């Protein structure tokens, strides 16, 4: 008849108390031992719909594309987006943006950008001297230099101090999102909104970043030729002075600055943390980076740059990072999405504007798919006889219309960017293996490695 089965709310609380303290992930995954897949939790004033497990997440998105495609807001950072920029977006504003934003996200190759960010890395690691370092900033110096090149026209230099500071103010935004308080934020924004907080700090560090995109914004808008457009910032202004007689152009200053801003925060934190949760598991099972470096010694061998071409003769490196991903279970609770239409779901009816939560990690964690779904076990992405075996439960980047634009760059970029460092170091640090805690910092919105030292030791 009406919504989805779960746990009977309060007024003004809505389900706070049956909720695990642990977060909102945790008290999901409790609901649905009782209530199944598809359940109704009210966080804080409304109530929002859990879809759980890849039939009924590719049910909704897929086959009911028509009705699942519209964006939820994320309470901490929606008072900044305020539904500008493609993420954030929905209706024509999204539709035009997300057709832009792919369009221009392909227009020097991609890959090549990447092999030479690659080839900057190494030598970085090679002058560290084997000096032992929290790799979060130079992960996040390589993915945001990708999209930097694509965005702004260039690359910025790893000990460029104003770049560290940007690359520090994603980090803690991302954190701070994540935290307990950002999940209680999102059940209580309409109070909390009125006190100090997290989501003033989310707010201000975003700000901040927003600034510089504003100055580059105008260096480029200065010095713009028509006929050759840089990067995308250049390609934008061009539809936007194409549209300007239309006062209702999707092409404004702010989805400008916020697409961008949603692009450059996109492409510096998402490939970055993946591949610094990767780097504390091949702490923690040597073996399985030894074997890696064996496939590259024999696919590729030490000197020759690693490429795309490569992995389909490496199995192996694939299905550790296919496992890296899935373990790593970057959004573990997606992106929130929010039905555009009444629409009618396994007996249930759901109404236009309802938030949906597509519970991603519940796919990543299926056991029917994944034997052993908590281990990270590189098997789970190989077949017998040791050939990759994909598995459409791997949806880390979700699904349907809106699912990750840069599902190609980041798969790229964690290739690449995972061999070429394997080919050149092994990885060393002060704790043992058994000793290793993967239990994440945070476990909101995103799941946060913890913090660790790692050294990069050259191959000889
Ligand atoms: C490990 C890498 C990444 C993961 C796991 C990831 C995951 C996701 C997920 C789960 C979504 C939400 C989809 C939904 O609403 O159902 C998303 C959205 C999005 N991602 Fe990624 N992402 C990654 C990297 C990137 C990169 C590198 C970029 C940009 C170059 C990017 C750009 C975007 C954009 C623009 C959206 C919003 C899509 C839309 O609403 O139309 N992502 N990503
Ligand atoms: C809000 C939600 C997610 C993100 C990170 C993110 C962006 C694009 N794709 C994957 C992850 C930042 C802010």
């Not at 990885?427 to 000793?435: F, H, N, R, T, Y």
Request: proline content about 7%; hydrophobic content about 40%.
């Amino acid at each position: 008849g009406k919504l989805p089965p779960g746990p009977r709310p309060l007024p003004l609380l809505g389900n706070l108390l049956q909720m695990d303290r642990r977060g909102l992930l945790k008290s999901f995954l409790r609901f649905r031992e009782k209530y199944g897949d598809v359940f109704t939790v009210h966080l804080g004033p409304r109530p929002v719909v859990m879809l759980c497990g890849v039939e009924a997440i590719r049910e909704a998105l897929v086959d009911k594309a028509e009705a699942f495609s519209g964006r939820g807001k994320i309470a901490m950072v929606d008072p900044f987006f305020r539904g500008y920029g493609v993420i954030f977006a929905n209706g024509n504003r999204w539709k035009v943006l997300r057709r832009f934003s792919v369009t221009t996200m392909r227009d020097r190759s991609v890959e090549e950008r990447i092999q030479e960010e690659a080839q900057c890395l190494i030598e970085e690691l090679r002058k560290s001297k084997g000096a032992l370092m929290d790799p979060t900033f130079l992960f996040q110096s390589i993915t945001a230099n990708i999209i930097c090149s694509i965005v702004f026209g260039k690359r910025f230099h790893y000990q460029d101090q104003e770049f560290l500071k940007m690359l520090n103010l994603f980090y803690q935004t991302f954190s701070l999102i994540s935290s307990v308080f950002g999940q209680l934020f999102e059940l209580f924004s309409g109070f909390l909104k009125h006190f100090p907080g997290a989501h003033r700090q989310v707010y201000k560090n975003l700000q901040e970043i927003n600034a510089y995109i504003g100055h580059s914004v105008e260096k480029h808008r200065e010095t713009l030729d028509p006929s050759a457009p840089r990067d995308l910032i250049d390609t934008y202004l061009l539809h936007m002075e194409k549209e300007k007689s239309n006062a209702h152009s999707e092409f404004s200053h702010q989805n400008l600055n916020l697409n961008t801003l949603s692009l450059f925060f996109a492409g510096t934190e998402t490939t970055s943390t993946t591949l610094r949760y990767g780097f504390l598991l091949m702490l923690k099972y040597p073996h399985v980076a030894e074997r890696v470096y064996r496939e590259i010694e024999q696919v590729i061998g030490p000197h020759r740059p690693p490429e795309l071409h490569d992995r389909a003769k490496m199995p192996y490196t694939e299905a550790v990072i296919y496992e890296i991903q899935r373990f790593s279970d970057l959004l573990p609770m997606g992106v929130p999405h929010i039905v555009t239409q009444h629409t009618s779901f396994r007996g249930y009816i759901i109404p236009k504007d309802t938030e949906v939560f597509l519970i991603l990690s519940t796919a990543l964690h299926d056991p029917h798919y994944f034997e052993k779904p908590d281990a990270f076990n590189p098997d789970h992405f190989l077949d017998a006889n040791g050939a990759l075996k994909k598995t459409e439960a791997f949806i880390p980047f979700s699904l349907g219309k809106r699912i990750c634009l840069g599902e190609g760059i980041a798969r790229a970029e964690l290739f690449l960017f995972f061999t070429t460092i394997l080919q050149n170091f092994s990885m060393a640090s002060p704790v043992a293996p058994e000793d290793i805690d993967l239990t994440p910092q945070e476990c909101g919105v995103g799941k946060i490695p913890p913090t660790y030292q790692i050294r990069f030791l050259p191959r000889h």
